[PDB]
Design a protein around this ligand. Sequence first.
Ligand SMILES: Nc1nc2c(ncn2[C@@H]2O[C@H](COP(=O)(O)OP(=O)(O)NP(=O)(O)O)[C@@H](O)[C@H]2O)c(=O)[nH]1
Ligand SMILES: [Mg+2]
Length: 166
Amino acid sequence: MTEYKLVVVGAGGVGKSALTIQLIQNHFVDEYDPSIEDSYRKQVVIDGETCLLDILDTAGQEEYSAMRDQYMRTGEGFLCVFAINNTKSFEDIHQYREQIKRVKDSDDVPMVLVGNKCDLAARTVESRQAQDLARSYGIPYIETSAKTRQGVEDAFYTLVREIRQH
Ligand SMILES: Nc1nc2c(ncn2[C@@H]2O[C@H](COP(=O)(O)OP(=O)(O)NP(=O)(O)O)[C@@H](O)[C@H]2O)c(=O)[nH]1
Ligand SMILES: [Mg+2]
């Protein structure tokens, strides 16, 4: 078994914590702790390869960049969570990547861009725009929904692929 430190990122309400709680507890946060260091780790099998998945759930921009260096430096990969309905996410998701290149000290970093909230009926950022970043960054683009729970794990699994490749 291998330990995969999955460092999740988010502007706050993009669904970062929603994807984690789903991939771990599998449910919609109705009264869970408001952001904490109590990271989680689930055991799965990537293409017939049993390995551990330690998904770290950080805070949503609550003044703690100092710790961001401790996690990012210890994270095997990064997952960019953006809301198709919230254009704000697409904004922070851009600068967010720049933070990784700094810590990792290299443009080549294993990460994935997921589009949470793919169930809502009021999307602002079309797949085209979301693809621009994934195509410009050279990373995969997956769509999921914490509410309906569609291809949720599909987004996480993709991360393991990027890492393994590197
Ligand atoms: N409609 C819809 N809402 C979602 C979906 N996923 C998450 N949400 C909701 O959108 C909001 C996102 O913020 P929240 O759940 O508080 O997570 P958070 O903001 O990261 N917590 P915090 O800010 O304390 O770190 C919550 O109400 C969350 O339940 C989704 O797929 N569809
Ligand atoms: Mg949160």
